[PDB]
Amino acid sequence: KDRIEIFPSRMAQTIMKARLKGAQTGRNLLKKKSDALTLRFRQILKKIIETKMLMGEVMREAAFSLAEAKFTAGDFSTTVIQNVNKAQVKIRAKKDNVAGVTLPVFEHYHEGTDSYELTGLARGGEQLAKLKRNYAKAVELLVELASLQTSFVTLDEAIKITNRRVNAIEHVIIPRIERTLAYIITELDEREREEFYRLKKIQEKKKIIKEKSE
Amino acid sequence: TMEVDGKVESIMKRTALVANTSNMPVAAREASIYTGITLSEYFRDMGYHVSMMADSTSRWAEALREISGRLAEMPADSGYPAYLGARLASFYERAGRVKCLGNPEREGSVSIVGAVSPPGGDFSDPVTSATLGIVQVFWGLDKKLAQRKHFPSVNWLISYSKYMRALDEYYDKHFTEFVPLRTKAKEILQEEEDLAEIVQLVGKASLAETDKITLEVAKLIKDDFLQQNGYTPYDRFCPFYKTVGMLSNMISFYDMARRAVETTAQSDNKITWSIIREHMGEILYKLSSMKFKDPVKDGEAKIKADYAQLLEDMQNAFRSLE
Amino acid sequence: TMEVDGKVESIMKRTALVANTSNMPVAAREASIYTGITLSEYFRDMGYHVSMMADSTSRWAEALREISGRLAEMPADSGYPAYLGARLASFYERAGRVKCLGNPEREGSVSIVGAVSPPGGDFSDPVTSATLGIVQVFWGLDKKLAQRKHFPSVNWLISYSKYMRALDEYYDKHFTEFVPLRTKAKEILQEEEDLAEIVQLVGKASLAETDKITLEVAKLIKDDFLQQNGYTPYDRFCPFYKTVGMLSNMISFYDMARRAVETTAQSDNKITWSIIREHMGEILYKLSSMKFKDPVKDGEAKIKADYAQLLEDMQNAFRSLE
Amino acid sequence: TMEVDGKVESIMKRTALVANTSNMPVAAREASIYTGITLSEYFRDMGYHVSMMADSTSRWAEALREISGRLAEMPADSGYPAYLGARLASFYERAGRVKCLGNPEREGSVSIVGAVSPPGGDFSDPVTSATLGIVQVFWGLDKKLAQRKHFPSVNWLISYSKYMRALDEYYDKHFTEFVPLRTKAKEILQEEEDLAEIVQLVGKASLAETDKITLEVAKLIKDDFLQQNGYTPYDRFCPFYKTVGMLSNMISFYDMARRAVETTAQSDNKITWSIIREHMGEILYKLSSMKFKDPVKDGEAKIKADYAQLLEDMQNAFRSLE
Amino acid sequence: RGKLIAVIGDEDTVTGFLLGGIGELNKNRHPNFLVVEKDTTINEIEDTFRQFLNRDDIGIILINQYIAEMVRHALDAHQRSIPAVLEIPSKEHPYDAAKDSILRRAKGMF
Amino acid sequence: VCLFLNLANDPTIERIITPRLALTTAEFLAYQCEKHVLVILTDMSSYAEALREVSAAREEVPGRRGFPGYMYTDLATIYERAGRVEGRNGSITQIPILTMPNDDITHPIPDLTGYITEGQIYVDRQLHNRQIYPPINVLPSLSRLMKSAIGEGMTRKDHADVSNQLYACYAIGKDVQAMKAVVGEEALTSDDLLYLEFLQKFEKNFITQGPYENRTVYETLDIGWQLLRIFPKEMLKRIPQSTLSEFYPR
């Protein structure tokens, strides 16, 4: 609705000016928070593009190392896929922070159970070891990229919410207070005008009393 | 015309007018109001239940203001004389139901429906304030609803009646369900009002699934139970059987939808307002077009039967949904 | 009663009351202030350090307003007679420290403390404004604190005292350390005021250690120094040695916490408020409990020694954290 | 000073100043507007084309408010008298181009360019609002553009002129091609007003080539057409033939760039702003330098021929790109 | 307690990440990797992606670019953040920056 | 110094005539004795209250906010007895001092005083509470004729430039200080840390003076330079290079 529904008065005018400036301070701070989130989000998008580009090359090299391993080691794929046991790699989620907003990111970490030790023992040897190394490199790059993606999504949510807050303020709350202030000023002018009329009337009646007495 | 003893008669035989247009002498407005209320008191004393409409008492208050300005008196708020409050109270206080004078025992009434025309549309207006300090029912109207053509433009939040507790003694023995239906309707409109501030600032993503039902049922009630195009053969008049029927169907829909949500919120068969909307696009349109049933072109029995059939249709749709 | 020379003596042996209840005539309501101030000036001339409490200069301005209206004078802002400023000046400016007349050299004084009560706490009310133009001290009221039931409810952001310039000499002679404590207390309160505006608009996550310590020492000051239960035996009156000891301990805590975090910032062995609070939770408890020391039974020596021991414990705890 | 018939003359040979300060009699401040307009009407009657500049009709209006207050008239909207709007209306209405009285046939005129001083840019106060309702042109000088070093500081978004329809008659006779250029220039600038928000949303690299051309030509107009350093010899005074020539060439470039992009959107050899700039840097520099063409030394014919030669070069460059 | 990594890709891809050290069998003996053979249908590849999406300890998910294009509608349904979804190259089909499920959020990717 | 005192409890008519006595003496000392006078009128709000009292005594009806309608002409009569006059080597400068009621810059006294006068110097409550003196808030403060009082031969070559640059860096520092609490300190760039340091040292070394410390304009300018050297030259974008090269080093 149009007006805040405070009753006209000088006290009300003071309170409304305080509240208008409070809402404008909120607008400014939230707009700066949105700008921080937007700069970070844009940076994160650009690095997503760049790291996808790097991922292309890195995966291509890893696939060639796999080819090279097959060259020496043969069809070990089934060996690996069967001796699954438990994972040597386990990822830890971490609470990053930008602006007031918490960004989930990932930390690469090892549980140490290399179920595929000795697998290349017969022939695979160094080529299979280098394959382990290549896909460890891939794991690191993709963990960094996954931290990137999670930050990107959460920043998207944060940006949407903060823009909705800033628009809400500057399109509803501030205009509401401005309308209430205009109404308060008008009604105080009305009080003053009524007082002026009453005093003018009293003065005229005193003049008429002078004429009645003289 | 109206049917008396099966014979139709015009209502100009039971209406009397006291016309003092805006441009006619100003002082005559006061005499117009008092002539009207005295005629109503006469017909009351005969033992009739008269109703006096005062087409605008703000124009009367302006008559008093102008006369007082001519008399050179000291004004109260915004120029009206100090005695505007006393005038309005004494005029409204001639209204109540009475055990009339005289020997043949009788009973009469003079209801007073006094429209206030506040300057600028703001109820700080001294006429409006002094009036609301006296009148027991306040059908405040809202210019924004009026612009949206939500006629009647009654503001269902701030408007009030202090007679509701007096009438239940009669509601519970003529329309026994109406009191609970009314309480639930008011709760629904209050809940939608409370949500409106949140949704305006935040958007509908935050809504609970029962709150979506509250919002959509409130929109149904506002658009299709409250508003009533007064210049159409179907809704120029709306008997209370039709009114209570419409409200009963809408509140029954609300109860069934909330039950459907609260029973499947904990499940994988989760019912949502969107699912109900898609599944019952027809039932909702029937609830929307109930207002078009014509009290006279379609008999009371026909309209009550159709509303009962819509209730059955809904009670089947919800079972088939769940 | 009061202690004087080791004997409890009534306070009416050294007090006088000028009762003027609200229903007693308006003229007397006006002359009450003058009679009181003249008695106070009489004892001033005798040579005493008199102190006068005027329960409502607002209800005095009502007598002035009403009398002006009855006399048919022209009013001014809000209806008060235009000479309200001059009248309030003539009342207040009889204050001060004076070299009394007459031969035997002497110097009394008349402190004046005039309560104001504007409508609804309005700060533009003409009596409040004219007062602010005259009074050297103003202990304004914070309604937020009043509603929180935080007593005293002094608005330490818009209340003011212009006597600090004078009293700095007395402090540099008696409580030499008090002035920088006062300045830092005001600075801390203002920084916390600033930071709360961000905290409510965004949240506490972004605060640095310095900001956290400012907030978590400002809460200590606002709850355990600037808050006083006037009805308890220990805080019915807080001597100045107790007040300066309390403030010294709190500000020393601020200084040393900020020292730790500033010194260990931009370094791996980082100290934080999150560490300090848990490391010396006892120290914070005793800083909070300082208020409970009771001069009436605890000696000045005991209280000074206890506060110095708390300072010692604080230094030990900080030195260990470092 | 001004040049007339090849000699430098002081404009006080053709200017009269009704100048007064704020401590002068209030009746002097209020009478200033009328004294000025009466002198201007005297010269109009002689058949001269008077131009009368009021320096603050807001201060004249405050003089009016003061005189009204001294007379104790009823205060109208926001304190100004009941007749401020009427007085402003009549005063400005005294303007106009007239066939003067008397026998020797004459035309004169009085152009009232009176300034108005809003409170901090708020155009809602009675003097500014009535002035903008009465007046037909408004030039809206802007401290922000002055800060950006854009002289004149005309805002070209708040500014407006309602005489365009009246002047189409004159342009269709003397400067036939100015009208379309006016329309197109204002439309370019209005387009940029939204392209800026597009840039904020998605960045300059995200705009189609046509709207990139819009942006660069709009900056060209801002920097080298609407910007005019008033202290230089060459373009302190810009004759209308030169202005229409400048805008004609700039809009010719705009249309040619739009054509180049639009006619190759249907091809793989699609043209871009980068192609256009790198291929026609000389043309862009020439357009930017069109300012320097000096009317005092570079006659009308020479400037017209130079602008037409720029048009020839631009035609050839676009054709060779095409 | 820590998160895993899951894979939807070729036999070579699964083997390579397995030698990287991602693989385990959970307490249900479920794997965290699918070898994509032509015999498997698109409904089943979508079901596998959905299973990884539902399972809360999975962590990061990897998909070959083209296979993810086939799984796309479930990817488009996966709007939430916590399990990342890395659309990766393949020896069969290269990766393309265009129209990735995550990148659909953006207008600044030119 | 010729000092006129109208105590709070002296007659309000004596208050009405005090500013006029002050300015009459100022006109004698300036336009007849030819010596530059500085008139410091203190608490023009307390003067306007006396004007109100005299009007009500005359039994005029109140104007806006209770003050007389002619308050503009009256305050103008007081203020506009100032300025230099052709053919007399003296002048009269004024520095009215206003107690703004309710801190409302729209109140008739400050509104009319702004209409008649040529600037404003804000004493600010946040600065005062932070215990800065003189709590002159230089962001809303203005001197519409400063551009005549500075430059070579009046103060020094670099006065206008240093003033503009200090204002710009102070405002950017206030902006950065508002942003800090939202983005956090470690999210700040090195330039923003420079601006925060400049804000601190501008409020602590330049604005803050202490009551009895007298700084010539030259000393104020050198303090300004000592603050502007927080920035490398490329950040002082409002100072021309012809000045930067001359003053910046050392």
mmCIF file of N, CA, C and O in Angstrom, chain C residues 229-238:
data_model
loop_
_atom_site.group_PDB
_atom_site.id
_atom_site.type_symbol
_atom_site.label_atom_id
_atom_site.label_comp_id
_atom_site.label_asym_id
_atom_site.label_seq_id
_atom_site.Cartn_x
_atom_site.Cartn_y
_atom_site.Cartn_z
ATOM 1 N N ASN C 229 21.549 -1.253 38.156
ATOM 2 C CA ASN C 229 20.315 -1.557 38.872
ATOM 3 C C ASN C 229 20.263 -0.662 40.099
ATOM 4 O O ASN C 229 20.910 -0.919 41.114
ATOM 5 N N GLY C 230 19.480 0.411 40.006
ATOM 6 C CA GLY C 230 19.458 1.414 41.056
ATOM 7 C C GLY C 230 18.808 0.958 42.343
ATOM 8 O O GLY C 230 18.880 1.687 43.339
ATOM 9 N N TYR C 231 18.174 -0.211 42.350
ATOM 10 C CA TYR C 231 17.463 -0.706 43.521
ATOM 11 C C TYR C 231 18.247 -1.744 44.305
ATOM 12 O O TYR C 231 17.732 -2.268 45.294
ATOM 13 N N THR C 232 19.432 -2.050 43.906
ATOM 14 C CA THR C 232 20.214 -3.020 44.649
ATOM 15 C C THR C 232 21.163 -2.316 45.610
ATOM 16 O O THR C 232 21.564 -1.175 45.371
ATOM 17 N N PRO C 233 21.549 -2.974 46.705
ATOM 18 C CA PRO C 233 22.451 -2.314 47.662
ATOM 19 C C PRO C 233 23.773 -1.889 47.057
ATOM 20 O O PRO C 233 24.353 -0.884 47.487
ATOM 21 N N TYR C 234 24.279 -2.634 46.074
ATOM 22 C CA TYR C 234 25.622 -2.373 45.576
ATOM 23 C C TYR C 234 25.646 -1.289 44.507
ATOM 24 O O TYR C 234 26.639 -0.562 44.400
ATOM 25 N N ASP C 235 24.576 -1.148 43.726
ATOM 26 C CA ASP C 235 24.542 -0.187 42.631
ATOM 27 C C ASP C 235 23.512 0.916 42.833
ATOM 28 O O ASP C 235 23.160 1.603 41.871
ATOM 29 N N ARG C 236 23.024 1.110 44.057
ATOM 30 C CA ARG C 236 22.255 2.308 44.354
ATOM 31 C C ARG C 236 23.083 3.562 44.127
ATOM 32 O O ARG C 236 22.536 4.617 43.794
ATOM 33 N N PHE C 237 24.401 3.466 44.291
ATOM 34 C CA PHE C 237 25.295 4.596 44.065
ATOM 35 C C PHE C 237 26.689 4.057 43.790
ATOM 36 O O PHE C 237 27.202 3.243 44.563
ATOM 37 N N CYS C 238 27.300 4.512 42.700
ATOM 38 C CA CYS C 238 28.603 4.010 42.289
ATOM 39 C C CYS C 238 29.655 5.090 42.490
ATOM 40 O O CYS C 238 29.819 5.959 41.624
#
